[PDB]
Ligand binder design. Structure first.
Ligand SMILES: CC(C)[C@@H](C)/C=C/[C@@H](C)[C@H]1CC[C@H]2C3=CC=C4C[C@@H](O)CC[C@]4(C)[C@H]3CC[C@]12C
Ligand SMILES: [Pb+2]
Ligand SMILES: [Pb+2]
Length: 436
């Protein structure tokens, strides 16, 4: 049907009613075909680097050229600061990809496919027009199905720029039908020997009543560097304090201590992450410059091998029949194809449970950061990057919502685990079946 008839359709009304009794698992909602997306959540990991040049820019900044790599401030105080500005710009550039991609390609936000345990998604940005960039690889794996957890790593060996992280969400509906989403997990970006810890922000999906869902960010995201520098990004929008759609304000501080006082901000960036934003140095509100304009820089999609060459575990290959059914909008075919794949998975889980066998993750392992870790789990190294950056930020290392600080209510939750998924490069190095 036409989108204009979605909201009043029998299908949408039945969907809204299933919300009333939402059991906590999104996969239980009777989402009609027209609100379904043929894309699996394992693919969302690619949204961390759809602007190859911004992802790599920090690695080209050094003690001998940093002032030449800071468009908004040729008088930037240091290379460390120039790089934090670049990482901040890169982070902001990921937002449109992360949260607007479906509105553009599908017409609105839609329900993504719930990945099966073990699902893989791999590809690469060849960066053919920039030989100095080199190839950038994306590895994404569904390390958990119950609950859904996606782990990933994006790396550029030529320039020593590597990223790794994992993501999980916990969602619930408000009485007004707003879908509240708390993200869990974090992402670390290493630029040569310099590291950055990034925490995703909470968000909500509105437009549910009118059958035209869309994402709006809220809360805060942090970018803590080993240099001590810290960027605090606050999100707002319509219905909130600023009243300006997809807005944000980011402040960069010398360190987490300074972040307690907005007056100490070295730079203040403000605008819309899905559009343009300006930056101001210190208190010089007079002199402001364009920081980023999402509309001027097209996203660059990674190269994914053709379906015919994909391994059974690769997302698109495995979901092929279901994606096709969704594109056709065939009620029965969608249910049939989805059940076939999911029932097969269900049977695998039952065999494993009765046989005493467990699914082995391919390129990621779950490290236990608790003071009293599970006896068989891998544990972090004394010089662990996350530990030192979390300590500098005073960020909780528990499985609390992303961005939770030590002491917050979420960090004081009793018997809360501290398990984090980590990329194991050697596992990809000795990978014998999957190729790019
Ligand atoms: C009809 C409703 C139920 C549909 C539209 C909503 C589906 C939810 C589950 C979808 C819509 C937007 C999706 C979404 C968008 C962007 C990101 C950023 C990515 O880095 C992690 C996954 C995450 C956080 C996912 C999680 C699942 C979300 C929140
Ligand atoms: Pb709103
Ligand atoms: Pb384990």
């Amino acid at each position: 049907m036409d989108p204009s008839q979605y909201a009043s359709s029998s299908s949408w009304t039945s969907f809204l009613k299933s919300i009333a009794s939402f059991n906590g698992d999104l996969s239980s909602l009777s989402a009609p075909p027209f609100i379904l997306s043929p894309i699996s959540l394992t693919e969302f990991s690619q949204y961390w680097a759809e602007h190859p040049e911004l992802f790599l820019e920090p690695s080209f900044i050094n003690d001998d050229n940093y002032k030449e790599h800071c468009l908004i401030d040729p008088e930037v105080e240091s290379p460390e600061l120039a790089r934090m500005l670049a990482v901040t710009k890169w982070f902001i550039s990921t937002l449109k990809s992360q949260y607007c991609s479906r509105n553009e390609s599908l017409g609105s936000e839609k329900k993504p496919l719930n990945p099966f345990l073990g699902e893989l998604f791999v590809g690469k940005w060849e960066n053919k027009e920039h030989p100095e960039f080199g190839e950038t690889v994306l590895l994404s794996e569904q390390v958990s199905h119950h609950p859904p957890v996606t782990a990933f790593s994006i790396f550029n060996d030529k320039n020593k720029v590597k990223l790794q992280g994992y993501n999980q969400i916990k969602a619930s509906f408000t009485k007004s039908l707003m879908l509240t989403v708390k993200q869990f997990g974090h992402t670390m970006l290493d630029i040569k020997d310099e590291s950055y810890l990034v925490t995703p922000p909470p968000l909500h999906i509105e437009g549910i009543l009118v059958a035209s869902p869309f994402v709006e960010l809220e809360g805060k995201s942090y970018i803590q560097s080993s240099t001590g520098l810290l960027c605090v990004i606050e999100f707002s929008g319509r219905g909130y304090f600023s009243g300006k759609k997809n807005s944000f304000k980011a402040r960069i501080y010398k360190d987490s201590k300074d972040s307690k006082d907005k007056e100490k901000a070295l730079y203040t960036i403000s605008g819309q992450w899905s559009g343009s934003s300006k930056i101001i140095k210190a208190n010089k509100k007079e002199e402001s410059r364009l920081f980023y304009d999402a509309a001027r820089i097209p996203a660059e999609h990674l190269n994914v091998k053709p379906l015919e060459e994909q391994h059974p575990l690769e997302s698109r290959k495995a979901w092929y029949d279901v994606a096709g059914a969704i594109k056709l909008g065939d009620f029965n075919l969608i249910a049939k194809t989805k059940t076939e794949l999911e029932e097969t998975q269900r049977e695998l889980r039952k065999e494993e449970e009765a046989k005493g066998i467990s699914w082995q993750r391919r390129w990621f392992k779950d490290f236990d950061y608790s003071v009293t870790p599970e006896e068989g789990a891998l544990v972090p190294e004394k010089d662990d990057t996350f530990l030192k950056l979390a300590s500098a930020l005073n960020l909780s290392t528990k499985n609390a919502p992303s961005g939770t600080l030590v002491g917050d209510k979420e960090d004081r939750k009793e018997d809360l685990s501290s398990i984090h998924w980590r990329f194991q490069r050697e596992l990809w190095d000795e990978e014998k079946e999957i190729v790019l």
